[PDB]
Design a protein around this ligand. Structure first.
Ligand SMILES: Cc1nc(N(C)C(=O)Cc2ccc(-c3ccccn3)cc2)sc1S(N)(=O)=O
Lengths: 381, 270
């Protein structure tokens, strides 16, 4: 029975409260004018450099590691607005203990089609101070933040300053600052008791860093954001898995996630799922190669559906029971697909994605190892 | 006198049914045991719906009819001259020892602001092993609160059993926290000359099983089970969890490759 969680959410609620209570100084608060000014510009070149202050708490871990129960506890202790990346996460975090919408809905989303990146920009001081970063992030959603800024100047963020956002891996880096801005842009508009109180928006982003640059990478990786949010004092990691009950497979998913050297023993293990069943979910690595079952799978009912996806589209998806990726175009890519089904009595694969040449990314794993080594990061089993 | 907080519900989403409920201003078990007879002149009531409960009105109170409502679960006639579906049968609804005590703690009795102020664990009432003296007619069969109010209000658990619930919650959490805190200090202080990362995962994932494995967690729950509510003879005991973990945390020889040896063993027995 999960119990160590009941005693690891405790220190998390302490730090989340310490962050949700603190009040900024005088000037360190977006004045209302700073928003019409953004609405007063035609090219993201008139944007004046200046902080939008914020603090963030990271709850990260493997899929099925117990992040859901930490959200369940925080929802029922702290006053928070609970949200998700995409309606998968929304229908996930949605009610078995005591509504929930996507974080895109919270700041509003015409706003769908976006020519993001159209307008240009370059940074200045190499260790860009937050003011340099947000100057870029606001630019990225020009024609997105622009309509949002014009309309509101022409309110769930106004209820609480703790904002739970599950599945942060689906949101790009430019959504860390946007959710900041449209928070400050709403609290400063209506003048809610939060605004008078000088409270910084405390975001609690929960999601898998290695299993799906996004928000989590933008916080874990950038030096200035680490120094600003003090992620040493604002990080808790759920080392566990309640759906993998076999030793070898759990070791595979552990040598993959935390980035340690592959072993010929592990290779030997993986040479047991290679198979060149009507249920095994056919994940792929091309959006054309999934329709390719127009020929083989479709009309196979003529002679005789989550079934077809791409591995990078199945991230954060829920599967019950065969990777058919194209060779040469695949170690952090299979990890997304192999971890959908709970056990290895349903996984199938077509090329042994550990002896075949592949592409391995290791920045996130390096930071995760250094973080677990940090004495001030909460670890929960 | 008696300040009573009545958590109430109504057939037409808001008669009134106090489906759980009383304190006196101080200036601990025994006084409540003397209040839960089987004891106040005046019952001033704060009637509340879903701290996690918000007062909806107040009534000063004929302590006769009110005591009737609190005791034999009777509904107050709107004698009061002074939400969700009956849901409430799904949540908080395994059985009596949970339905009558955890409802009264979670929503009502964290006003004492204990370290239990914090979740709906319904996981400490089960380590609350007070003897169950059975009774017939306890067939739930409840779907449109009197059907559940009588059920709740005349059960033996809520007496000296009720008075010893907050104290046991606190005691539970205290021993648990001391053991988990000592274990956490031993885990953290050992993440500070460090090993090649190949077996740093072996260290973390093996320490977090040498101190919170299912069998040793069960042993701890045994060392923290309570049979009589009276704090005097409560049948708790020193927990072995720290003492049986410090069988594994003899990493002091690592001051003058071992983790996968224990990993291989543990993995064999698991
Ligand atoms: C004997 C033993 N049992 C141990 N348990 C309970 C576990 O691994 C349980 C587990 C299994 C899989 C994961 C996981 C980790 C990353 C990605 C996916 N899944 C985590 C935890 S760990 C040891 S050992 N060899 O260190 O003494």
């Amino acid at each position: 029975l999960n119990f160590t969680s009941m005693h690891g959410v405790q220190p998390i609620l302490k730090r989340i409260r310490e962050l949700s209570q603190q009040q900024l100084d005088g000037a360190q608060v977006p004045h209302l004018q700073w928003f019409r000014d953004v609405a007063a510009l035609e090219s993201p070149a008139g944007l004046p450099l200046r902080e939008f202050p914020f603090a963030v708490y990271l709850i990260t871990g493997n899929a099925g590691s117990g992040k859901s129960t930490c959200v369940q506890t925080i929802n029922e202790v702290l006053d928070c607005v609970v949200t998700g990346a995409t309606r998968i996460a929304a229908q996930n975090m949605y009610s078995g203990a005591f509504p929930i919408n996507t974080i895109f809905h919270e700041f509003g989303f015409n706003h769908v089609q976006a020519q993001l990146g159209q307008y240009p920009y370059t940074l200045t001081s190499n260790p860009a101070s937050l003011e340099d970063l947000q100057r870029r992030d606001l630019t990225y959603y020009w024609e997105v933040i622009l309509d949002l800024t014009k309309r509101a100047l022409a309110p769930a963020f106004t209820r609480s300053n703790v904002i739970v956002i599950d599945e942060a891996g689906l949101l790009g880096r430019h959504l860390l600052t946007a959710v900041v801005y449209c928070w400050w842009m709403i609290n400063a508009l209506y003048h809610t008791p939060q605004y008078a109180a000088r409270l910084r928006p405390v975001l609690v982003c929960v999601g898998s860093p290695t299993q799906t640059e996004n928000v989590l990478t933008y916080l874990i990786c950038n030096r200035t954001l680490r120094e600003y949010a003090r992620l040493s004092y604002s990080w808790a990691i759920f080392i566990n898995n309640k759906r993998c009950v076999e030793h070898e497979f759990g070791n595979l998913m552990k040598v993959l996630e935390y980035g340690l050297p592959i072993t010929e023993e592990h290779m030997q293990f993986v040479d047991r799922f290679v198979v060149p069943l009507p249920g095994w979910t056919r994940l792929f690595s091309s959006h054309k190669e999934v329709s390719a079952y127009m020929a083989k799978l479709h009309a196979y009912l003529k002679v005789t559906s989550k079934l077809a996806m791409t591995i990078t589209r199945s991230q954060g998806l829920s599967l019950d029971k065969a990777i058919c990726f194209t060779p040469g175009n695949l170690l952090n890519s299979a990890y997304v697909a192999m971890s959908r089904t709970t056990s290895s009595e349903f996984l199938r694969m077509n090329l042994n994605p550990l002896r075949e040449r592949h592409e391995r990314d290791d920045v996130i794993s390096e930071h995760i190892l250094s973080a677990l080594r940090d004495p001030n990061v909460v670890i929960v089993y | 006198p008696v300040e009573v907080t009545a958590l109430y519900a109504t057939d037409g989403c808001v008669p009134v049914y106090i489906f759980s409920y009383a304190y006196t201003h101080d200036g601990r078990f025994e006084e409540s045991r003397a209040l839960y007879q089987a004891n106040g002149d005046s019952f001033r009531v704060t009637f509340c719906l879903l701290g996690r409960t918000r007062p909806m009105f107040v009534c000063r109170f004929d302590v006769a009819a009110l005591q009737d409502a609190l005791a034999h679960g009777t509904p107050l006639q709107p004698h009061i001259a002074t939400a969700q579906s009956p849901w409430f049968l799904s949540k908080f609804g395994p059985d009596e020892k949970s339905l009558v005590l955890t409802t009264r703690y979670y929503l009502l009795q964290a006003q004492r602001l204990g370290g239990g102020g914090a979740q709906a664990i319904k996981d400490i009432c089960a380590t609350y092993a007070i003897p169950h003296a059975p009774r017939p007619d306890t067939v739930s069969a409840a779907s449109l609160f009197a059907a559940i109010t009588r059920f709740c209000c005349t059960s033996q658990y809520a007496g000296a059993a009720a008075a010893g619930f907050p104290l046991y919650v606190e005691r539970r959490i205290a021993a648990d926290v001391r053991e988990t805190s000592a274990l956490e200090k031993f885990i953290t202080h050992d993440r500070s000359l460090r090993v090649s990362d190949r077996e740093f995962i072996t260290y973390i994932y093996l320490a977090h099983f040498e101190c919170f494995s299912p069998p040793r967690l069960a042993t701890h729950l045994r060392a923290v089970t309570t049979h009589d509510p009276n704090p005097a003879a409560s049948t708790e005991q020193p927990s072995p969890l720290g003492r049986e973990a410090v069988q594994f945390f003899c990493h002091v020889r690592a001051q003058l490759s071992f983790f996968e040896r224990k990993a291989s063993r543990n993995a064999l027995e698991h």
